[PDB]
Amino acid sequence: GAMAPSYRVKRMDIAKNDEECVVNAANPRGLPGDGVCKAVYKKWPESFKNSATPVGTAKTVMCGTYPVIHAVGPNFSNYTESEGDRELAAAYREVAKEVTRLGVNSVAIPLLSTGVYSGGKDRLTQSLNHLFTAMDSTDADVVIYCRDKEWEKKISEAIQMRT
Ligand SMILES: N#CCc1nccn1CC(F)(F)F
Ligand SMILES: N#CCc1nccn1CC(F)(F)F
Ligand SMILES: [Cl-]
Ligand SMILES: [Cl-]
Ligand SMILES: [Cl-]
Numbered sequence: 001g002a003m004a005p006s007y008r009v010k011r012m013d014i015a016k017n018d019e020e021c022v023v024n025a026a027n028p029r030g031l032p033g034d035g036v037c038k039a040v041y042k043k044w045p046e047s048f049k050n051s052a053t054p055v056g057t058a059k060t061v062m063c064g065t066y067p068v069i070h071a072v073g074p075n076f077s078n079y080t081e082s083e084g085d086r087e088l089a090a091a092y093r094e095v096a097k098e099v100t101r102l103g104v105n106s107v108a109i110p111l112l113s114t115g116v117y118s119g120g121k122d123r124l125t126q127s128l129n130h131l132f133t134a135m136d137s138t139d140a141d142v143v144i145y146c147r148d149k150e151w152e153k154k155i156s157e158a159i160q161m162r163t
Helices: 036-043 081-102 124-135 149-162
Strands: 007-011 022-025 058-063 066-071 106-110 141-146
Touching: 007 149, 022 036, 058 081, 066 081, 081 106, 081 124, 124 141, 124 149, 141 149
Parallel strands: 007 141, 022 066, 022 106, 106 141
Antiparallel strands: 058 066
16 A cells, blocks of 8 residues: 555646556447547557456456556436436546555546546546445556646546545
8 A cells, every 4th residue: 555645736748747657538349449548558559458348347457567457437428417426436436446456645536527538528627526325445657648738737636625
């Protein structure tokens, strides 16, 4: 575990993370995809061997000894708000199980279902609160990655609010 488990936020490409493992915002088919998933495919392509997994699940594949946790959030274009919310919460619970199983002291994690799977809505708060619900009982240092300047400020505020 980390000596004083923390949350932090950085605005940069998650493929350049300084953590012991990474969470990919994967598609269910283990395809290269776009956005975070394509950056992850370029950096860790070996981790896409048998990475296909259903919505609401996470599947870890090693790239050398570096773990890539493929977490499949729902595409809100296809799910109802209710069913999508349930699958988004479930994907983060499976990430917390994998992080715990791996025994890592730190994890890099993107906000699932906030980009091309958002169904054109702002889901920062919804996705971040499901992240916290899953990760708060873990003792890994969590570093959240984002690309937008206003999102960095909102995520930083949300972390600081809990102290
Ligand atoms: N509503 C929305 C999408 C949005 N705007 C700025 C950042 N984001 C998240 C995203 F970049 F799409 F992943
Ligand atoms: N069939 C479907 C998707 C759906 N139904 C109601 C809301 N949504 C998602 C969206 F509104 F696009 F975010
Ligand atoms: Cl960058
Ligand atoms: Cl997405
Ligand atoms: Cl972002």
